[PDB]
Coordinates of N, CA, C and O in Angstrom, one line a residue:
X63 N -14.6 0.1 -7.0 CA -13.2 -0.3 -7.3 C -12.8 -1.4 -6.3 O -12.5 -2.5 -6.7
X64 N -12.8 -1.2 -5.0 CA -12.7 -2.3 -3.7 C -13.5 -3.5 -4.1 O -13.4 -4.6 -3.5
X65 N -14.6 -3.4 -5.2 CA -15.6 -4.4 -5.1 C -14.9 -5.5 -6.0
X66 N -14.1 -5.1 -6.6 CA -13.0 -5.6 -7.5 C -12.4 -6.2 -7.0 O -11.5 -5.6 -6.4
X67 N -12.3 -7.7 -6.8 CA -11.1 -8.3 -5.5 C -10.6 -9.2 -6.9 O -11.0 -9.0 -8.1
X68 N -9.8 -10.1 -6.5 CA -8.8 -11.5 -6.9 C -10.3 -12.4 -7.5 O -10.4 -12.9 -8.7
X69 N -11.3 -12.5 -6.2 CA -12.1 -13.3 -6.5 C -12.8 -13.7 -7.7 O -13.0 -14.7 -8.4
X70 N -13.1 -12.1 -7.7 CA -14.0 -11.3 -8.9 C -13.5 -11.5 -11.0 O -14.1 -11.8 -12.0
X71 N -12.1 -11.2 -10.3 CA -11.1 -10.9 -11.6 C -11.1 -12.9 -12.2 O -11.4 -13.5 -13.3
X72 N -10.5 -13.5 -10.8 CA -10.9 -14.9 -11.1 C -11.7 -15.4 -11.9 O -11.4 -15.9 -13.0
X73 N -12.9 -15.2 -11.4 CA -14.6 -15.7 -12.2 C -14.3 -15.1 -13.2 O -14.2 -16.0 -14.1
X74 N -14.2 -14.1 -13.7 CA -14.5 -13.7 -14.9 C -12.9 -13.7 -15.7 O -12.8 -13.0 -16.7
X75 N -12.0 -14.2 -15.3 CA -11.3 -15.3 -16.4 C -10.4 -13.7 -16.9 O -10.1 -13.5 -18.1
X76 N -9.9 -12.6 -15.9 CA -8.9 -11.2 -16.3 C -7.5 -12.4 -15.9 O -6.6 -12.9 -16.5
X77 N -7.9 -12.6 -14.8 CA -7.0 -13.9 -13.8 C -7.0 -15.4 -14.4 O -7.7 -16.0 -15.2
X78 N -5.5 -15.8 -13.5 CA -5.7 -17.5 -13.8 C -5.3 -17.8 -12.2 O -4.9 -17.0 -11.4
X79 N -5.5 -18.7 -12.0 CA -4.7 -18.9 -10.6 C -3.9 -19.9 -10.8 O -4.1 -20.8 -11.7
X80 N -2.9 -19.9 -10.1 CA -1.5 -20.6 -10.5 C -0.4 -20.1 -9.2 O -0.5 -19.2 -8.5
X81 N 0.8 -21.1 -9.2 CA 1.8 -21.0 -8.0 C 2.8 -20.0 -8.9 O 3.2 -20.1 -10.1
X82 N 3.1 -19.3 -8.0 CA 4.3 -17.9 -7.9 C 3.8 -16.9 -9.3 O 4.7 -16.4 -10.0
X83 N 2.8 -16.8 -9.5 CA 1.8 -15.8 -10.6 C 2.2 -14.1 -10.1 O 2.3 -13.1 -10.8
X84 N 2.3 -14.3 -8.8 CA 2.1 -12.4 -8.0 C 3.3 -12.5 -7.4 O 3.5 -13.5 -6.7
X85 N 4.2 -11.5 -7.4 CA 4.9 -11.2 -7.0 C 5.4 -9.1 -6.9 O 5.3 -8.2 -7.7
X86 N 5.8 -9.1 -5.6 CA 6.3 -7.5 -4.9 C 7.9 -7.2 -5.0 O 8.7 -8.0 -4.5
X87 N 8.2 -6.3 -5.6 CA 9.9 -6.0 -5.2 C 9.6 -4.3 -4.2 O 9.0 -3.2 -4.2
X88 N 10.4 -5.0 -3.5 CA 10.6 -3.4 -2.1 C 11.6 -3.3 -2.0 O 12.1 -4.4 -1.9
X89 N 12.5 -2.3 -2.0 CA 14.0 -1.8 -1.5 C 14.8 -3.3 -1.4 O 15.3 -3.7 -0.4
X90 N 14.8 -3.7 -2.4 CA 15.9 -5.2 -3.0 C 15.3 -6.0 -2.6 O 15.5 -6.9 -3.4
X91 N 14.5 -6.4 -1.8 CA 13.6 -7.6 -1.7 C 12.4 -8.1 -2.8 O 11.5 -7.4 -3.2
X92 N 12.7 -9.7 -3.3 CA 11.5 -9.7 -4.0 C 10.6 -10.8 -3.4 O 11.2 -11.8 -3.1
X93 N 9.3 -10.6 -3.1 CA 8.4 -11.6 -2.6 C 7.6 -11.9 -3.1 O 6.8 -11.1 -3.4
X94 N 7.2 -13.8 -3.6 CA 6.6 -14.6 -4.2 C 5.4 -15.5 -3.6 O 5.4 -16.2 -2.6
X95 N 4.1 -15.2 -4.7 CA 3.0 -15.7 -4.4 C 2.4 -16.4 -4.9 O 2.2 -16.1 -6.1
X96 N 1.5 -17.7 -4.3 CA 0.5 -18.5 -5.2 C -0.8 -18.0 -4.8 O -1.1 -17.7 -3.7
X97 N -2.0 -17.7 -6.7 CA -2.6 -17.3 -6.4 C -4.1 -18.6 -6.1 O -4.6 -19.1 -7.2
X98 N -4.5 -18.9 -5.3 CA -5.7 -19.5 -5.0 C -6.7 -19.6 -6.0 O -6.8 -18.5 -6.5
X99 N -7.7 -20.6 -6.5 CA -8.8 -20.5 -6.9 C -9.6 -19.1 -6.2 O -9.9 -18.1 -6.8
X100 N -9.9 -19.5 -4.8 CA -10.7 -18.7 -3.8 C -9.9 -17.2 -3.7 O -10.2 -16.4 -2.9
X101 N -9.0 -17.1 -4.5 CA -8.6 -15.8 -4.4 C -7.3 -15.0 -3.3 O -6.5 -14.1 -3.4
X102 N -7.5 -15.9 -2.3 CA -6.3 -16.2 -1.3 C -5.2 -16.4 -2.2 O -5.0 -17.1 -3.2
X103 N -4.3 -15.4 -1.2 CA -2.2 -15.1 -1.8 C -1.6 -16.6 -0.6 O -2.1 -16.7 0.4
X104 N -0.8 -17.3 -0.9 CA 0.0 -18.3 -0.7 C 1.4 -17.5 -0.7 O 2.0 -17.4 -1.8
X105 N 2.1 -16.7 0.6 CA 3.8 -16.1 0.6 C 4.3 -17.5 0.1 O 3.8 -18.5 0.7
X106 N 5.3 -17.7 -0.9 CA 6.0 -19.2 -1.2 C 6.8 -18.8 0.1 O 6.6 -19.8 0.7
X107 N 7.4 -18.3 0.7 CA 8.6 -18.4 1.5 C 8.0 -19.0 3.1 O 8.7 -19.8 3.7
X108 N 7.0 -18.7 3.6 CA 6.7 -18.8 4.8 C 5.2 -19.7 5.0 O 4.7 -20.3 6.0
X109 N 4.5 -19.6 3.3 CA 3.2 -20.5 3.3 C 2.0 -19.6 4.0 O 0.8 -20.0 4.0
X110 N 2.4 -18.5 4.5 CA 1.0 -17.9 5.1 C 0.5 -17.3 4.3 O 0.9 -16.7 3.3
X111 N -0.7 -17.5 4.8 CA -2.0 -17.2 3.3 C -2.3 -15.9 3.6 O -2.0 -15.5 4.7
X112 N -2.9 -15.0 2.8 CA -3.1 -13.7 2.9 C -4.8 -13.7 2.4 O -5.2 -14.5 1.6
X113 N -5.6 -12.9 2.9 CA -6.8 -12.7 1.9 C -6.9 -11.5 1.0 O -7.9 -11.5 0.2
X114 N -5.7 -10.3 1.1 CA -5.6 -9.5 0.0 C -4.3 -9.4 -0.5 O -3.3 -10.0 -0.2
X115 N -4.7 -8.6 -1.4 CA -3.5 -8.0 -2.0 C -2.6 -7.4 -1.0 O -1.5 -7.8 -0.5
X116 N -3.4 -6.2 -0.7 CA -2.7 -4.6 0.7 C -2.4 -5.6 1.6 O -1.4 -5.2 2.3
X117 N -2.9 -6.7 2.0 CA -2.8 -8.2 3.7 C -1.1 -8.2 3.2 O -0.2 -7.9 4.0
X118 N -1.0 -8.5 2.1 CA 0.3 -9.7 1.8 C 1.5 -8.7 1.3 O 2.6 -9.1 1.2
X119 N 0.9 -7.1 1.0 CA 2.4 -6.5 0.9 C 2.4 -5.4 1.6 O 3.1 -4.5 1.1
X120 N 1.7 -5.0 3.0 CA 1.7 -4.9 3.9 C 3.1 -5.2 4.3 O 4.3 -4.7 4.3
X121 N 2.1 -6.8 4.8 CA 3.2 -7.6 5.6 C 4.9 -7.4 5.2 O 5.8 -7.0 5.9
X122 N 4.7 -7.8 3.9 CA 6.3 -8.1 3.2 C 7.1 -6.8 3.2 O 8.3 -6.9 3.5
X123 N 6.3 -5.5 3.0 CA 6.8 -4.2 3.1 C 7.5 -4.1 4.7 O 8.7 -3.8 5.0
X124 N 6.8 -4.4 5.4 CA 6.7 -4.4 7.4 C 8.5 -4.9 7.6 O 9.4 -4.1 8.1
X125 N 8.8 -6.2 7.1 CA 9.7 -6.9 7.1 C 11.0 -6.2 6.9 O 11.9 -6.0 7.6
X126 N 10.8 -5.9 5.5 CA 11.9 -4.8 4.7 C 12.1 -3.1 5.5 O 13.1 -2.4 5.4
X127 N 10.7 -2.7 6.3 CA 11.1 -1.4 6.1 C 9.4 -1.3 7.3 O 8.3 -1.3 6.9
X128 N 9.7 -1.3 8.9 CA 9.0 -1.4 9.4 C 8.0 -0.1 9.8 O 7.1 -0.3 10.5
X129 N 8.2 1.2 9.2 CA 7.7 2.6 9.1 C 6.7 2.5 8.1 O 5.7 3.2 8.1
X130 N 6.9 1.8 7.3 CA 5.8 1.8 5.8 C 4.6 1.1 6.4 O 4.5 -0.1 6.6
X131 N 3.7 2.2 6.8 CA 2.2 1.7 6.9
X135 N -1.2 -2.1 -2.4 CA -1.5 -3.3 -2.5 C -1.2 -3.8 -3.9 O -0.4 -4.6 -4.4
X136 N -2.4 -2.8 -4.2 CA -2.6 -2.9 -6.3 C -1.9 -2.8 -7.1 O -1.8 -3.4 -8.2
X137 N -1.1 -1.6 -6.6 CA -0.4 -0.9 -7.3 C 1.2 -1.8 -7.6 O 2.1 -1.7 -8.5
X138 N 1.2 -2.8 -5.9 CA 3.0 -2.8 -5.5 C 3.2 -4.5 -6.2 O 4.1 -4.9 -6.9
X139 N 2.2 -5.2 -5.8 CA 1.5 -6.5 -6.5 C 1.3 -6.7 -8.0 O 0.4 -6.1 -8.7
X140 N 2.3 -7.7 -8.4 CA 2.4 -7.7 -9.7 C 1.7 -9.3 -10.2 O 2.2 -10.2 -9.6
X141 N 1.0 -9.4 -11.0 CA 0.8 -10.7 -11.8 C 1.3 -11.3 -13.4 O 0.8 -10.9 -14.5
X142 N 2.2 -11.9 -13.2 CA 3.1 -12.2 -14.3 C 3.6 -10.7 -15.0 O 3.3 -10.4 -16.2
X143 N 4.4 -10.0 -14.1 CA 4.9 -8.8 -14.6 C 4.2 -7.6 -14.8 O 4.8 -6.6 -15.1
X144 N 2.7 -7.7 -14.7 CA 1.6 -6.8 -14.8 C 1.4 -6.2 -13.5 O 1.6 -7.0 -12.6
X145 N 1.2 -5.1 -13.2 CA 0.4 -4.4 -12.1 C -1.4 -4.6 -11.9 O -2.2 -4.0 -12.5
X146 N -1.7 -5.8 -10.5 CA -2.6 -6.1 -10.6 C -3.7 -4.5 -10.9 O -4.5 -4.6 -11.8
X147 N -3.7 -3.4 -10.2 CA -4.5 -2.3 -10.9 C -4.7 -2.1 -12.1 O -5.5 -1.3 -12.4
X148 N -3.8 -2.9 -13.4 CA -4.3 -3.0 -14.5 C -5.4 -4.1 -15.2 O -5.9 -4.4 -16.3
X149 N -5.6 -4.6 -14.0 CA -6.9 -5.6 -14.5 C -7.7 -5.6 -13.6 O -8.4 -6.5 -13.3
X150 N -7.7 -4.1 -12.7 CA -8.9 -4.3 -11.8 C -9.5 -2.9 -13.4 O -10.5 -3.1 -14.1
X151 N -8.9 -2.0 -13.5 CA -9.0 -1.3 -14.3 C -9.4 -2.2 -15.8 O -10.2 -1.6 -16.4
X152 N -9.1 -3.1 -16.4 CA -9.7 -3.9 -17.8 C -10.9 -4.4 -17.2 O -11.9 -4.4 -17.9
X153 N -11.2 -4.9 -16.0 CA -12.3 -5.7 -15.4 C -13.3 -4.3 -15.2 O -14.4 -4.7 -14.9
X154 N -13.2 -3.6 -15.2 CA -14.2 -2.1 -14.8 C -14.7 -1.7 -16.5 O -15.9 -1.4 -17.0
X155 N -13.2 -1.7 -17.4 CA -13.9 -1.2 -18.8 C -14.3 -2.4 -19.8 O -14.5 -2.3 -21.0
X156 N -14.3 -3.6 -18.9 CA -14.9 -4.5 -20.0 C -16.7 -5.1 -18.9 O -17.7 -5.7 -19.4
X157 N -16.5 -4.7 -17.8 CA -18.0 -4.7 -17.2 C -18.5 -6.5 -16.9 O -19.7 -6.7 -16.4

């Protein structure tokens, strides 16, 4: 399942990459992402690159609510990225 990255989903075309595609909502905060060829998250608000999913809503979670502490919270055009690590596992 971990072997399943951005990269992965990329290459084999589950993904597109494109600016503000992934986006997190946390306790009224929403935070916006471009996603890289190479797989790397672009925060639009601050420009710092992430290399995961769990890297970049971590962080954003930290901000909102510093006790909390990926797949599931990270969305790609309205989708929950775990639903295309999950189509990328049953299509092989």
């Amino acid at each position: 399942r971990r072997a399943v990255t951005l990269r992965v989903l990329l290459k084999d075309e589950l993904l597109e990459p494109g600016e503000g595609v992934l986006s997190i909502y946390y306790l009224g905060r929403k935070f916006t992402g471009d996603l890289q060829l190479d797989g790397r998250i672009v925060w639009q608000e601050t420009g710092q690159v992430f290399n995961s999913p769990s890297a970049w809503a971590t962080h954003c979670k930290k901000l909102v609510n510093p006790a909390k502490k990926g797949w599931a919270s990270v969305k790609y055009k309205g989708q929950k990225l775990d639903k295309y690590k999950a189509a990328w596992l049953r299509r092989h």
